[PDB]
Amino acid sequence: MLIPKEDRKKIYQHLFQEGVLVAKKDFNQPKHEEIDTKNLFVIKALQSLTSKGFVKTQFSWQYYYYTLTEEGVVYLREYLNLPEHIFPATYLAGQS
Amino acid sequence: ENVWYSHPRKFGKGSRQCRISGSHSGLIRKYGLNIDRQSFREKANDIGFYKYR
Amino acid sequence: RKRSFKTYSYKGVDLEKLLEMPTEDFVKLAPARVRRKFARGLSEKPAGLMKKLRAAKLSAPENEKPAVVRTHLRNMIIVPEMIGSVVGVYNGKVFNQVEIRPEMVGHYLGEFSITYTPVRHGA
Amino acid sequence: AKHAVVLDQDKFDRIMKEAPTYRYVSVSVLVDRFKLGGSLARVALRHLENEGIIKPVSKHSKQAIYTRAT
Amino acid sequence: AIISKKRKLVADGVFYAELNEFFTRELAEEGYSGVEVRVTPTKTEIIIRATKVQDVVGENGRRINELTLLIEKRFKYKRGTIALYAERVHDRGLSAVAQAESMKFKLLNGLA
Amino acid sequence: QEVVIHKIRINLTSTKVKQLENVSANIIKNAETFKLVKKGPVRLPTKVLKISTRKTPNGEGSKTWDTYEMRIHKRYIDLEAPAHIVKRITQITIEPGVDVEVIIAA
Amino acid sequence: PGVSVRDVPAQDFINNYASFLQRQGKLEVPGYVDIVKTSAGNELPPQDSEGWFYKRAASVARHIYLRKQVGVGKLNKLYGGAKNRGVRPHKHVDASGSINRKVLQSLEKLGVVEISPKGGRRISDNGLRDLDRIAAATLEDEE
Amino acid sequence: SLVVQEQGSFQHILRLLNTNVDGNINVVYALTTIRGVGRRYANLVCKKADVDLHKRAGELTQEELERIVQIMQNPTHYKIPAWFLNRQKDVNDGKDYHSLANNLESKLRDDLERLKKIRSHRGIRHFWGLRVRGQHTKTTGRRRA
RNA sequence: ACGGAGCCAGCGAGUACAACCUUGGCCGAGAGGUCUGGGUAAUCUUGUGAAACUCCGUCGUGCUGGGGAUAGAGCAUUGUAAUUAUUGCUCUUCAACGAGGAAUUCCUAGUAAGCGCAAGUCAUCAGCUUGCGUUGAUUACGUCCCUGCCCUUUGUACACACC
Ligand SMILES: [Mg+2]
Ligand SMILES: [Mg+2]
Ligand SMILES: [Mg+2]
Ligand SMILES: [Mg+2]
C-alpha cells in the first residue's frame, strides 16, 4: 500500500499489455518475474484493485490469477491514458 | 523495505514449500512433486498415480 | 622464583604470545571446529562485538573489569584478543555474565551460561 | 578361572605319552582331560600331525578331528 | 527441459492436475467437467469439456484467449504452441462432475 | 539424389499400454509401406514410480499405507533411414497421450 | 592336456602366490605395515601382520585376472565389510583407500598389473606367466 | 608353532608400570590389562618388540620388557605417527603426548580437573555426574554413579 | 569372536540453471580431499562384486580376545551457526548384562527367524519406515479350553440402547 508510485505505474502498464497477471503467493521475494518490482507489491496492487470493482481473482496452488473486467479496462485506461483500439486480451492481435 | 527481513533459507524444512497449500509437514519431494501428501492423496489419480499393488 | 604455577593455555608454550597472536595464528593453533568456522565465510560474527570489546578495554577504569559486552552471538569462540573482559551470554532470558580467563581458550561462549536450570529432587 | 592353562616341560611330556592309541583326537577331547587350554591343545594337535603318529579325519577350524595311525 | 523421462511425465501429470483444479474453480459458472490435454510437436491441444460451451468460448475468442495467456504465464510458454477448444459433452448425465457442479449450484441458488 | 542416412532413434515413453502398443504398431506398418531397414520395436524395462504414503492426514488410528505408483512404458524404434523419410513419419502417426520423440543423431 | 588358473582353488593359490612373493621379496613395502587398520571397520589390525601384504596383492592380482577393469574403489568396496558400529546395527563401508592403492602401485612395478583404458587396471604379459606357473605348481602338490 | 619345552615356570606375574602383567596368556592382552592400553595400541607396540603374538610371553626376556616400556613412554622418538595417541594437542603451542599406566589415570584426573576449572557444559555435567554428550536420560539408565 | 582369504543379490534412486549420483587417477591409517570424467539414465554411478555366509589361522569356556556403554582428547564433513558431543574417523574408557520373573507379542512357507541393502524424510544425521533381495527351519494343517467376534434360540421394566 505504501508504494513508490513509479513501481505501481509499471505494474498497471504490464497488466494492460497482457490483460492478465500470474502472481505467486510468495511474500519476501526480492523481485517479480517480468516486472522489476517485488512480488508482494504486485499482490498489494492487485488486492487494491479487486476491492474497488474489477478484477476477477483466484488463489489456487499459491498462484493468484487476475483478469480485467469491462470496468477494469476503463479504469486502467484512465490511469495510463491509451484512448481506444488497444492491446489487453479482449480480442486478438492479428491471426493467432 | 526494512533490511533484515530474511534468515538464509536455502535448505531444510522452511525452504521446501508445497505447490498447493504452503505447508512444511509431510511434503512429497520424490519425483519433484513438491506436494503435501494430503493434497497428493486427494489428486493422486489425476497426476497419473494409481493404486495397483 | 620464575614460572608462575604453570602456563594457562592451548597446546605447548606460554601466555605472552597468546595475547598478541590475533586470529590467523590462533586458527592455525586450534582444534578443527574453530578452523572450519574461520575457513567458512565470516560476516557479522566478529564485526560489532569485537569493536565493543576493544572499546570496553580502552574506556575501562584500569585494574577493575571492563564494561559487560552483551552478546546474542553465543556461537562465538573465545579468541585471546579479549581475555579479561566480561561478556553477557544470552540464554533467551538474561544476558548471563561469563568471565573470560586464560583457561577458557578456544571454547564457545554458549557453553558457559546454561539455558535450563538444572535438575533437583535427586542428583 | 578353572586353571589348566599353564605351560610346562612336565606337562609337555605327559601330552606326548597321552598321544598314541587314542580313538577321538580333537580340541575338546584334549581339554576334557584337564589339559592345556583350547589353543594350547590346538597347537598340541598340530604337532601330532608333523610326522604321522595321529592322522586326520576332519580339517575344519575348531571342528578338527583326528585318529591314531592304524 | 530437457529433464528425465520419469520427472517430465510427473511434471506433466502435475501440470494437468493444476490446470484441472484451476478450471474447476475458474469455470464454475460455465459448468466445467474435465480437460483432455494432448501434447504434439509445436502445438498442444488443451481440450476442455463443459456444459455451457457458448459461455466458455464467450464471443468468438474472449474468455479462452484470457485463459491461454494465463497458462503461458504460469508455465513459461509462448503464443501458438497452446490452443484451446471448448466442446460439448456427449450426454451430460453420464459425467458425474457435471452433475456435481449442477447440484452445487442448485444448493447455492435455492431449492429443496 | 540425397539418400543420406543419419540413423534416427524414435523414443516412445508413456503410461498407457494399449495406446502405446497401437502407436508402435502404426510406425512399423508405415516403415513396411516406405520399405526401410529398421530394428523392430525395442522394449525397455518399465520404470515403476513408487510414492509410499500413509493414508491418514492426522497420523492417528491404525497405520495404513498406499503405494501410489505410476507405470511407464519406454520403447524404441531404431531407423536406418534418411532425414526426409523421418520428417514424413513424424508428421503422420501421432496419437494423444503417448510421448512421440526423435533423437536423430545415431 | 592344458594347464589353467582356475583348477587350483583360490585359498591354496594365494598361499602359493604369497610364498612365491616371499621367495623373491621384490614386491616392495608400502610404509604403513602393522601401523594400519586394513578395513575402516576392524578393531584389530592383521593377525599374521608380518607377511600378510603378500597374500593381499596376490588376492588383488587374481581378482584383476578374473575381472575386466577393476580400480581402487571397487576393491575397497569388495574388501570392506561390517562395522561393529555400536549398540546401533551394522553398515557396509568400503575398506581403507590408500592400502589397496599401494597394493596396485606395487603390482604395476613388478609387472603383474597393466594400465587399462576407459577406467581401471588389467593384466600384463609377464603377470600371466607367474599366475600359470603358480597354478601348475599347486596342481603338482595336489597330485 | 612350538609347545613349551625346557623346565619353564618363569614367573606367573610379572609386574610392569606399577600394574599387574598377567602370566602366560599374551603380550597384547596382558598390555590391555594395564590401565590405559587397548587392543589396537598394544598390537602396535608388539610389532616394535618383534615378539611372536602366538607366544604366551609370561616367559619373556627382561630386555624385551624394557623396550616395550620405553615405547610406552616415548611416542615421537620411535616410529609412531603421533595421532595414534591417547592425548594429542595440549598446553600452549607445542607437542602431543600420552601415557598408558598410573601415568594415564593421573593425566585423566588432571584433565578432569582442567574441565572442572573451565566450567564448560561438559565439565559442569561431570560435576553433576550425569550425561555430557547430549544424550537423553528420560528413560535410559535409572541407576547411575 | 577376531584377522585375512573366498566372494553372490534384488528393489531402487540420481543434476543444466543448477550443484544430483558421482566411477577412474593422485594425496590421507582414517574420515575425507582433490583434479578429471560418464550419466536427465536396461547405456554412467552399478555386476550398486551388500551383508550374513564359505576357507585357513589367532583366543579357548575367566564380566575373557564376549559386550560395547559411559567418558577424555584430537583429526574430518554439512551448514551462516554444531557447546545442549549433528554425523564420521582416530586412540584411549572399559560399565551393565553368563539367555531375563509376573505377564504377553508375532507367526503356518520361500513364510518365521537371521542378514544386509533401498528409497522415504535429507544441507547434515538411521537404532526409524515403506520396499527389496540373501540364508532359510522348527510345529499344526486341528479345535472351540482361553481371548475376541458372529449368528441362533431364549430373556430384558434397556432404545442417548450396560458408561
Ligand atoms: Mg557384533
Ligand atoms: Mg544399474
Ligand atoms: Mg573388556
Ligand atoms: Mg475386532
Automatic annotation (TrEMBL), chain A:
InterPro entries registered for this protein in UniProt: Plectin_eS10_N, Ribosomal_eS10, WH-like_DNA-bd_sf, WH_DNA-bd_sf
Q: Where in the cell is it found?
A: Cytoplasm
Pfam families listed in its UniProt record: S10_plectin
Any one Gene Ontology molecular-function term assigned to this protein's record: RNA binding
One GO CC term on file: cytosolic small ribosomal subunit
Q: Which UniProt keywords apply?
A: Cytoplasm, Ribonucleoprotein, Ribosomal protein
Give the protein's function.
Answer: Component of the ribosome, a large ribonucleoprotein complex responsible for the synthesis of proteins in the cell. The small ribosomal subunit (SSU) binds messenger RNAs (mRNAs) and translates the encoded message by selecting cognate aminoacyl-transfer RNA (tRNA) molecules. The large subunit (LSU) contains the ribosomal catalytic site termed the peptidyl transferase center (PTC), which catalyzes the formation of peptide bonds, thereby polymerizing the amino acids delivered by tRNAs into a polypeptide chain.
Oligomeric and partner information: Component of the small ribosomal subunit (SSU). Mature yeast ribosomes consist of a small (40S) and a large (60S) subunit. The 40S small subunit contains 1 molecule of ribosomal RNA (18S rRNA) and 33 different proteins (encoded by 57 genes). The large 60S subunit contains 3 rRNA molecules (25S, 5.8S and 5S rRNA) and 46 different proteins (encoded by 81 genes). eS10 interacts with GCN1 (via middle region); this interaction is direct and promotes GCN2 kinase activity.
Q: What is the protein name stated in its UniProt record?
A: KLLA0B08173p
Automatic annotation (TrEMBL), chain D:
What are the UniProt keywords, alphabetically? Ribonucleoprotein, Ribosomal protein
Naming one, the record's GO cellular component terms include: ribosome
Q: Which domain of life is it from?
A: Eukaryota
Q: Return the similarity comment.
A: Belongs to the eukaryotic ribosomal protein eS25 family.
> In its UniProt entry, what is this protein called?
40S ribosomal protein S25
UniProtKB/TrEMBL annotation, chain E:
Question: The KH type-2 domain covers which part of the protein?
Answer: 19-90
The record's similarity note reads: Belongs to the universal ribosomal protein uS3 family.
Could you identify this protein by its name? Small ribosomal subunit protein uS3
User: What's the source species for this entry?
Assistant: Kluyveromyces lactis (strain ATCC 8585 / CBS 2359 / DSM 70799 / NBRC 1267 / NRRL Y-1140 / WM37)
Phylogenetic placement of the source organism: Eukaryota, Fungi, Dikarya, Ascomycota, Saccharomycotina
UniProtKB/TrEMBL annotation, chain F:
Transmembrane portions of the chain? none
Q: Which domain of life is it from?
A: Eukaryota
| Keywords linked to the UniProt accession | Ribonucleoprotein, Ribosomal protein
* One family name in Pfam for this protein: Ribosomal_S10
Q: What does the similarity note say?
A: Belongs to the universal ribosomal protein uS10 family.
Which NCBIfam families does UniProt cross-reference here? uS10_euk_arch (TIGR01046)
This protein is called what? Small ribosomal subunit protein uS10
Source organism: Kluyveromyces lactis (strain ATCC 8585 / CBS 2359 / DSM 70799 / NBRC 1267 / NRRL Y-1140 / WM37)
Q: What is the lineage of its organism?
A: Eukaryota, Fungi, Dikarya, Ascomycota, Saccharomycotina
